[PDB]
């Protein structure tokens, strides 16, 4: 199952 | 023994030819189980292993949603990095990302991962402590600043120690028939004369799983590390792998050569010789 942190930009 | 789960992501810009292409795949050990390609007809994450098909519509919708979000953030990041590196918008660039966890025989987290690369070079990576970062350059340092200020590490660590290990364990149980079965290699040695002065001895390993394997030739019990031709382990296409190692031996001295095979599927390391 994947992970995700909304708006994570470099 | 130990197992791993990994998600791989690649975004490649193509100026003048539409938006960046995005491809991501998920693996448990060496078994591909999910894929997503932004260029597919109706982009959706698809199963690639039987044991994952049982997951419900909710699972697939969330996964598809995550894939699309990642695809979007990569597009934004590609534009951002052009600035960081003072680069023109005319060339094609690549952003790669991999993350996941390793668990021991007991199902305990052994190590977590999260690393990114830009144009094939290390960019930024989460350290094994799952709390600090290693930036490859001043540009990457800028990203580090944003991620620390946003507490990205804390959240990543939470996922890696929780959901990552939990679902990997869940997948290992549902696909135990295959994920927990090691197929030992079928092995043999071939002999091909090169000239009157020498011949080629090739040690083969076929149909094995997982990919990890050690193939080595010995001359009078001495490793031919320097004199051995070893090809990259390759996929047969049916989940198994293949590999071979070869040496050029003076004709007539074939018996002084022994091939040694190490694979977790083998109770004991193997020793093969050319039997003329």
């Amino acid at each position: 199952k994947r992970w995700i942190i909304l708006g994570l930009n470099k | 023994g130990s197992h791993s789960m990994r998600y791989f992501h690649t975004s490649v810009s193509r100026p003048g030819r539409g938006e960046p292409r995005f491809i991501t795949v998920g693996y448990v050990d060496d078994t591909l189980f999910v894929r997503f390609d932004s260029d597919a007809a109706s982009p959706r994450e698809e199963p690639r292993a039987p044991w994952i098909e049982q997951e419900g519509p909710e699972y697939w919708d969330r996964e598809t949603q995550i894939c699309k979000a990642k695809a979007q953030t990569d597009r934004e990041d590609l534009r951002t990095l052009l600035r960081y590196y003072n680069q023109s918008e005319a060339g094609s660039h690549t952003l790669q990302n991999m993350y996941g966890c390793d668990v021991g025989p007991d199902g305990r987290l052994l190590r977590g991962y999260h690393q990114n690369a830009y144009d094939g070079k290390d960019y930024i990576a989460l350290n094994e402590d799952l709390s600090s970062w290693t930036a490859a350059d001043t540009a990457a340092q800028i990203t580090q600043r944003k991620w620390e200020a946003a507490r990205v590490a804390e959240q990543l660590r939470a996922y890696l120690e929780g959901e990552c290990v939990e679902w990997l364990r869940r997948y290992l149980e549902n696909g135990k028939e295959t994920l927990q079965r090691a197929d030992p290699p079928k092995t043999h040695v071939t002999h091909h004369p090169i000239s009157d002065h020498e011949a080629t001895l090739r040690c083969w390993a076929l149909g094995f799983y997982p990919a990890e394997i050690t193939l080595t030739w010995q001359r009078d019990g001495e490793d031919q590390t320097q004199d051995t031709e070893l090809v990259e382990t390759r996929p047969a296409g049916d989940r198994t792998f293949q590999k071979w190692a070869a040496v050029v031996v003076p004709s007539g001295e074939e018996q002084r050569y022994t091939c040694h095979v190490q694979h977790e599927g083998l109770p004991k390391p193997l020793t093969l010789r050319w039997e003329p």
Binding site: - | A117, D119, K121, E232, P235, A236, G237, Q242
Partner: protein, 100 residues
């Protein structure tokens, strides 16, 4: 920009047995960037209907892909893999050797 030319291996899924159905594989790896052209050839002519794995990469970030097609080997028919890549000044062609 770093560029890594692709390693190429052309082989069959199962040991070659004339008249027996099998799969011809062309495995390209260790390359960067990802843009690559791979053709499976039968007696010099490009084979149609050739599938490929989804783009993935190794620990060193280099890419790898598997191109494959079903085929029934014979003694006459020659098979090969033709690869195009920015690192290559011309299409590289690797012949199938039912012993490698």
């Amino acid at each position: 920009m770093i560029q890594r030319t692709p390693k190429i291996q052309v082989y069959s899924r199962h040991p070659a047995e004339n008249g027996k159905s099998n799969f011809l594989n062309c495995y390209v790896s260790g390359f960067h960037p990802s843009d690559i052209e791979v053709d499976l050839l039968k007696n010099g002519e490009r084979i149609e209907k050739v599938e490929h794995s989804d783009l993935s990469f190794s620990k060193d970030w280099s890419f790898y892909l598997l191109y494959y097609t079903e085929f029934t080997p014979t003694e006459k028919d020659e098979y090969a893999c033709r690869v195009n890549h920015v690192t290559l000044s011309q299409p590289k062609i690797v012949k199938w050797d039912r012993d490698m």
